[PDB]
Structure 1
Amino acid sequence: GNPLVYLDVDANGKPLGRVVLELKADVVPKTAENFRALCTGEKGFGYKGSTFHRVIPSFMCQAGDFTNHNGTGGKSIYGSRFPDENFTLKHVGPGVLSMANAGPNTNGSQFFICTIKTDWLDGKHVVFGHVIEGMDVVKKIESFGSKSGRTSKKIVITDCGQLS
């Protein structure tokens, strides 16, 4: 079945709790596998220790730049970028998990969790999962964002991995 993965998130060094994500490998297997392996760290790199560096209230929480920690970096398990697998899943509401990009076919490791329906991203960002548990954690993260995306607390994925 589809993987379940987790992100354990701190804000200013104190735990907020756990976000559990279902990865829709049934729809986007290549995109799901990238995220899964970055959660386990099994390729020797991944999300552990990295940050939510861009958080915009009433929009989304973005993370996954584990190389430069500022939005310029990250990489996939396949290489520095990989294609848009499909656009079948839509940005239907809060809790959607989707790939950040720098235009078509530039998926790496950066991703975002929506806190609203973001329909204008349909056909532009690859949706690959959703929050199973821990939306309260996502709302906390969101509350530490700003219009510019700059966070007002240091939001760190302290641990991450695969549950099933």
Structure 2
Amino acid sequence: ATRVISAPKVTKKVFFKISINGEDAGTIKFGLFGDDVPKTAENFRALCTGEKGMGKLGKPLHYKGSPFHRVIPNFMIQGGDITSGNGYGGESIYGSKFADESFKITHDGPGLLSMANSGPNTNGSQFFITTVPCPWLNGKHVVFGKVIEGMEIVKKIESLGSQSGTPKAKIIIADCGEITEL
């Protein structure tokens, strides 16, 4: 026992490489709460690596190339639309939208990964990262990870958003994958 954590255990690590209008913006690192929400964390991890290949909607189950389509200053940045890329698409690794796995982990602070949805049990590939505490989202959105490195880049992406959410630059997951070197 090494740390005395006030927070869920990080059981898997993954990353995004961010491009803004074609230019590199750096890397964001995430750790996922695999012991708490293992089905949601596995979905996000396989979408990072792309290992499941082609989804039923005719585009890769891979976050690579997907944009951040809604960036709302002092709220959150939202991406993960891997089918149509317009903010209405997406697809999980489970051949269908899957159910809310747990609501125990709450949106207490900036930096948390959580799933976007359109109702109960409609999780897909779309996710969002908090930049403020969002306790009104508790019970509606499954939290399943957190930024562990590169929050400065999250903030950079934030600073490009609007009150409407339409961002002021094309913000792209240039590359992504699982951190496998320890």
TM class by smaller structure: over 0.9
Q: Alignment partner for residue 132 of structure 1, among 148, 162, 167?
A: 148
In structure 1, distance between residues paired with 2:71 and 2:100 = 23
Higher relative contact order (CA 8 A, sep 6+): 1
* Residue 145 (structure 1) shift: 0.7
In structure 1, distance between residues paired with 2:149 and 2:71 = 19
Does residue 22 in structure 1 map to residue 38 in structure 2?
A: no
2:174 is aligned with what amino acid? T
In structure 2, distance between residues paired with 1:83 and 1:6 = 24
1:18 is aligned with what amino acid? T
Does residue 147 in structure 1 map to residue 163 in structure 2?
A: yes
1:142 is aligned with what amino acid? E
* Residue 80 (structure 1) shift: 2.8
Q: Alignment partner for residue 114 of structure 1, among 104, 117, 130?
A: 130
Runs of at least 5 residues in structure 1 that lack an aligned partner in the other structure: none
1:90 alignment partner in structure 2: 106
1:9 alignment partner in structure 2: 18
Tell me, what secondary structure is at the counterpart of 1:138? helix
In structure 2, distance between residues paired with 1:135 and 1:3 = 18
The number of aligned residues is 164
1:48 alignment partner in structure 2: 64
Provide the TM-score with structure 1 as the length reference.
Answer: 0.98
Tell me, what secondary structure is at the counterpart of 2:15? strand
Q: Alignment partner for residue 96 of structure 2, among 69, 75, 80?
A: 80
Alpha-carbon RMSD: 0.8
2:129 is aligned with what amino acid? I
2:149 is aligned with what amino acid? E
2:7 alignment partner in structure 1: none
Provide the TM-score with structure 2 as the length reference.
Answer: 0.89
Runs of at least 5 residues in structure 2 that lack an aligned partner in the other structure: 1-9, 54-60
In structure 2, distance between residues paired with 1:55 and 1:10 = 15
* Residue 79 (structure 1) shift: 1.9
Q: Which has the higher Rg, Structure 1 or Structure 2? A: 2
Tell me, what secondary structure is at the counterpart of 1:128? strand
Tell me, what secondary structure is at the counterpart of 2:123? coil
* Residue 31 (structure 1) shift: 0.1
1:54-73 alignment runs, 5 A limit:
54-73=70-89
Identity of aligned residues (%): 63
Does residue 103 in structure 1 map to residue 119 in structure 2?
A: yes
